[PDB]
Design a protein around this nucleic acid. Sequence first.
DNA 1: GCTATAATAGGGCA
DNA 2: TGCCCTATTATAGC
Length: 184
Amino acid sequence: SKHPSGIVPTLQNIVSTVNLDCKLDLKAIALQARNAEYNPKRFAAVIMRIREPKTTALIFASGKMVCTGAKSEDFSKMAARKYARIVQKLGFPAKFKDFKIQNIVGSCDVKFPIRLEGLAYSHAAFSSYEPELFPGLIYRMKVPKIVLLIFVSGKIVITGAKMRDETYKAFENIYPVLSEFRKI
DNA sequence: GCTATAATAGGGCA
DNA sequence: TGCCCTATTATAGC
């Protein structure tokens, strides 16, 4: 009823941001922390990681923080919360302001090969397929505004969503098309 | 471990 | 001002 295709895209990566609302001393965090990495000349953030939920945090001097790698939105907020407390314990008056899911990446397998060239040709205003550069067809759906990477194998990557239902809807919108161009 | 995709954050530079 | 800096993640042919 929500997934007429019978297939449910698996969530693979969630990118979120949160505002710790306090400037941070990155050199102090990098020295005091254990799971930290800081190379100012390369990137302006402290890169930290935890095991559960398995994620990576990018902590900036401004107090802003990016959390990547989680398998769900809840897992992403949970992870972000642990990093916030890690930073709190380090001495800073960190809070958890304006948490937001910025991107959801999902993937699935329709279990049948696809004729990418024919698909791109019939949907040129939406498709970008150049095998010699990247083996996947880049499908830029407008409603919802989502990008799908369609491979000959039947495997699909769906990215750009800020709510999981967009991920699901884009896949459901694309399913009938993939079937039309099933490789025989 | 590069190719390409989305999204975020910051310093640095043409 | 734009854009790459970095890390994430599925995918696949090089």
